[PDB]
């Protein structure tokens, strides 16, 4: 933090607000950040030759809030990679007013990683052959992506220092899923075919079919059971899964804490069933995603090998290897032919969410020991129980809560995948569990 | 060092978008 | 080695669920309304922004 310190000051920074920002200006800044994110997501890059190749990173476009061929190609990568590299350096003991140096080096490294990513994204050939594009065009694309990542970091700091609600990672990820669901519901796009003109949006197609078709019953049947375009049984399943996740996320083990330092403040410490709120979903989706992009790049080179044929066998959906057993089955209908694949997938999704949750409670400092230390340091004690028994009463709840909120969230993802709900299961879980965070922020600011 | 506010961040975010549009328009009417 | 730990985990989870504060009708309605409002805001703002930029991207690109 001293050798690189010269380079850790030049980058811009956000001033902490002098006074507490009201819940009106915070929502205003959140809306401005969201609007900037969306507009940059819809603006194509300059220098692209042909965005006709299959997307190398199609699988991570959801978790990373990315949009191919646009300014927001990396999405929330500048935010995620900076934090990840900071934690990796801290854990490896390479790195230790020091907060300013840490928060400057974080942004300085999250832009070097952003540049490296903007170089890896171009040599993949998704924008065309770099030799044909030329050094000038490649450099211009890299500069555009660098400025976009800088804007991403600035907007995230704007949201986090107090000017807005929540964080960039949650807001952008939830936005790209809510927008996807709303687009698959109201798409003006019309995929023509031999049958005729039909809209790609389920509701718009329902209206078009009820208007232009004489056989109204066969129009309702079609608009409800289309197998080529989003139908209404996939939008009703989305609402049902939303309702189920909403019900199950409201579970909480209300602990009656009672302070002993300043006597008088009795309170409730809620231990939610979803203890790690969608962190198991982010971790599982990130694992599989970054593994499909690897088994997909290693299925072109080194083709026909053994390690490649076991890691994944692509067609682009997997048909064998490890990738096949991690991919959701094509609804419950495609389970009859392959039962072992469905069993392995349902087992993997639960046993990975549970493992990730029970590991994250120890890694993120939310384990029963850490909560007991917080209780001891704040004077909090459980009302009915004793003061030295707080650790036991927390160890009898928090580990089980984390494990079962991993199983529950994995099962909800599996159910959403099996119901054909729009937005996937990861997306519907990442949308609901992030809208609930903003709902909690809303109630907190409105009660304070 | 440099400590910008939310308003400069919004201005820079809008100017980058505008510059991208100007590049695209210049390319379209130059090609 | 497998039956006993799984049974203990199942019992612990069942007790935790039977001791959690499950939402009632009013809380479920409030959370559903808030989630619907947030989803509408984000999704429809993104939908309108995407609609605006389809002709624009068709012209410029
Ligand atoms: C077809 O081309 C190919 C082929 C191939 F054989 C491999 C690849 N590589 C490339 C490197 C490009 N990259 S990358 O730059 O896109 N990158 C992933 C990088 C991997 N490590 C480690 C990183 C780098 C090391 C130093 C800090 C971190 C995963 C890091 C985190 N991830 S995450 O798990 O997805 C994730 C996690 C959490 C969240 N939250 C919402 C909180 C979101 C996402 C994000 C990175 C920013 C993305 C792809 C990779 C496949 C690309």
**C-alpha of residue A77 to centroid of ligand 1, in Å:** 8
Domains of chain A in start order, with CATH, are 1-185+232-448 (1.10.3370.10)
Strand partners, A258: A266, A381
- Residues of C with CB below 8 A from B24's CB? 60-61
Question: What is d(CA A271, CA A397) in angstroms, rounded to the nearest whole number?
Answer: 8
Closest approach of C44 to chain B, Cα-based (Å): 21
Q: What is the DSSP code string of chain B?
A: ---B-HHHHHHHHHHHHHHHHHHHHHHHHH-
DSSP class of C20: S
Assess whether the C-beta atom of A115 lies below 6 angstroms from ligand 1. no
* Chains sharing 3 or more CB pairs under 8 A with chain B: A, C
Q: Is residue C18 classed as helix, strand or coil in its secondary structure?
A: helix
φ and ψ of A34, to 5 deg: -65, -45
Calculate the alpha carbon distances from A260 to A118, A267, A377, A382, A389 in Å: 54, 12, 11, 10, 15
- Three-state secondary structure of chain A: CCCCHHHHCCCCCECCCCCCCCHHHHHHHHHHHHHHHHHHHCCECCCCCCCCCCCCCHHHCCCCCCCCCECCCCCCHHHHHHHHHHHHHHHCCCCCCHHHHHHHHHHHHHHHHHHHHHHHHHHCCCCCCHHHHCHHHHHHHHHHHHHHHHHHHHHHHHHHHHHCCCCHHHHHHHHHHHHHHHHHHCCCCECCCCCCCCECCHHHHHHHHHHHCCCHHHHHHHHHCCCCCCCCHHHHHHHHHHHHHHHHHCCEEEECEEECCCCCCECCEEEECCCCCCHHHHHHHHHHHHHHHHHHHCCCCCCCCHHHHHHCEECCCEEEHHHHHHCCCCCCHHHCCCHHHHHHHHHHHHHHHHHHHHHHHHHCCCCHHHHHHHHHHHCEEECCCCCCCHHHHHHCCHHHHHHHHHHHHHHHHHHHHHCCCCCHHHHHHHHHHHHHHHHHHHHHHHHC
**What's the gap in Å between B18 CA and the centre of ligand 1?**
30
* Contact assessment for residue A201 and residue A187, using Cβ atoms and an 8 Å cutoff: yes
CB of A416 within 8 A of CB of A425?
A: yes
- How far apart CA A261 and CA A109 sit, in angstroms, is 43
Q: For residues C32 and A243, is the Cβ–Cβ distance under 8 A?
A: yes
How many angstroms separate the first and last alpha carbons of chain B? 43
Q: Which of A64, A68, A236, A74 is nearest to A149 (CA)?
A: A74
Q: How far is residue A147 from each of residues A29, A176, A410, B19, C14, measured CA to CA in Å? A: 20, 21, 37, 11, 51
Alpha-carbon gap, residue A353 to A408, rounded angstroms? 9
Distance, in Å, from the CA atom of A270 to the CA atom of A255, rounded to the nearest integer, reads 6
d(CA A260, CA A267): 12
* The pairing of beta strand A380-382 with beta strand A313-314: unpaired
Structure determined via: cryo-EM
Cβ-contact A289, A424 below 8 angstroms: no
Asked if C27's CB is within 8 angstroms of A404's CB, the reply is no
Angstrom CA distances, A240 to A409, A412, C31, C32, stand at 15, 11, 14, 11
Q: How many domains does chain C have?
A: 1
d(CA A253, CA A236): 31
Q: What backbone phi and psi angles, to 5 degrees, belong to A211?
A: -90, -45
d(CA C57, CA C55) in angstroms, rounded, equals 6
For residue B9, which of A171, A438, A160 has the smallest C-alpha distance?
Answer: A160
Nearest CA to ligand 1 atom 36: A286
State CA A429 to chain mean position distance. 9
For helices A233-249 and A202-212, angle between their N-to-C axes, nearest 10 degrees: 150
Which residues in chain A have their CB less than 8 angstroms from residue C32's CB? 243, 246
Q: What CA–CA distance (Å, rounded) separates A97 from A75? A: 31
Distance CA B12, CA C37 (A): 30
Residues 6+ apart with CB under 8 A from A145: A45, A71, A73, A74, A114, A115, A117, A118, A121
The long-range contacts involving C15-22, CB below 8 angstroms and separated by at least 24 positions, are C16/A253, C16/A273, C16/A397, C16/A400, C16/A401, C16/A404, C17/A251, C17/A273, C17/A404, C19/A253, C20/A251, C20/A252, C20/A253, C20/A273, C21/A251, C21/A252, C21/A253, C21/A254, C21/A270, C22/A250, C22/A251
Q: Cα(C43)–Cα(A120) distance, rounded to whole angstroms?
A: 31
Whether A152 and A79 have beta carbons less than 8 Å apart is answered as: yes
Q: Enter the resolution in angstroms.
A: 3.1
Residue ranges making up the domain that contains C15? 1-61
Beta-carbon pairs below 8 A across chains B and C: 7
């Amino acid at each position: 933090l001293e050798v690189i310190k010269p380079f850790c000051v030049i980058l811009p920074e956000i001033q902490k607000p002098e006074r507490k920002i009201q819940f009106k200006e915070k929502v205003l800044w959140t809306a401005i950040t969201l609007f900037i994110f969306l507009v940059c997501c819809q603006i194509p890059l300059f220098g692209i030759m042909s965005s006709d190749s299959a997307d190398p990173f199609y699988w991570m476009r959801v978790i990373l809030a990315s949009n191919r061929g646009t300014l927001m190609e990396l999405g929330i990568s500048p935010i995620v990679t900076s934090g990840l590299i900071m934690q990796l350096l801290a854990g490896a003991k390479i790195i230790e007013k020091d907060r300013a140096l840490f928060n400057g080096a974080q942004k300085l490294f999250g832009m070097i990683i952003t540049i490296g990513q903007s170089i890896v994204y171009v040599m993949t050939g998704m924008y065309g052959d770099p030799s044909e594009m030329g050094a000038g065009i490649c450099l211009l694309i890299t500069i555009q992506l660098f400025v976009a990542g800088l804007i991403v970091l600035l907007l995230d700091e704007l949201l986090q220092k107090g000017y807005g609600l929540g964080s960039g990672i949650s807001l952008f990820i939830a936005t790209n899923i809510c927008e996807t669901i709303v687009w698959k519901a109201f798409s003006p796009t019309t995929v023509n075919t031999g049958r005729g003109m039909e809209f790609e949006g389920a509701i718009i197609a329902l209206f078009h079919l009820l208007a232009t078709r004489t056989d109204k019953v066969r129009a309702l049947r079609e608009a409800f059971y289309r197998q080529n375009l989003p139908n209404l049984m996939n939008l009703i399943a989305t609402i049902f899964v939303f309702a189920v996740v909403i019900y199950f996320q409201g579970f909480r083990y209300e602990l009656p804490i009672r302070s002993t330092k300043v006597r008088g403040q009795i309170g409730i410490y809620p231990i939610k069933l979803f203890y790690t709120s969608n962190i198991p979903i982010i971790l599982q989706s990130a694992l599989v995603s970054n593994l499909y992009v690897i088994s997909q790049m290693l299925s072109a080179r080194f083709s026909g090998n053994l390690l490649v044929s076991l890691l994944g066998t692509w067609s682009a959906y997997p048909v064998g290897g490890l990738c096949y057993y991690l991919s959701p089955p094509e609804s419950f209908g495609s389970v009859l032919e392959d039962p072992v694949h469905a069993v392995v997938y349902i087992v993997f999704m639960l046993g990975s969410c549970a493992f990730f949750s029970k590991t994250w409670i120890e890694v993120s400092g939310s384990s029963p020991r850490d909560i007991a230390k917080q209780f001891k340091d704040q004077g909090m004690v459980i009302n009915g129980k004793r003061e030295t028994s707080i650790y036991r009463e927390l160890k009898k709840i928090i580990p089980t809560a984390a494990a079962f909120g991993g199983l529950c969230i994995g099962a909800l993802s599996v159910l959403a995948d099996f119901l054909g709900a729009i937005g996937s299961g990861t997306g519907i879980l990442l949308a609901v569990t992030i809208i609930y965070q903003y709902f909690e922020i809303f109630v907190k600011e409105q009660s304070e | 060092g440099l400590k910008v506010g939310p308003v400069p961040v919004l201005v820079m975010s809008l100017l980058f978008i505008a510059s991208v549009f100007m590049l695209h328009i210049w390319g379209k009417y130059t090609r | 080695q497998f039956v006993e730990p799984s049974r203990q985990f199942v019992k612990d989870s069942i007790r935790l669920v039977k001791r959690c504060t499950k939402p009632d009708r009013k809380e479920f309605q409030k959370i559903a309304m808030a989630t619907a409002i947030g989803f509408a805001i984000m999704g429809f703002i993104g939908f309108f922004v995407k609609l605006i930029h389809i002709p624009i991207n068709n012209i410029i690109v």
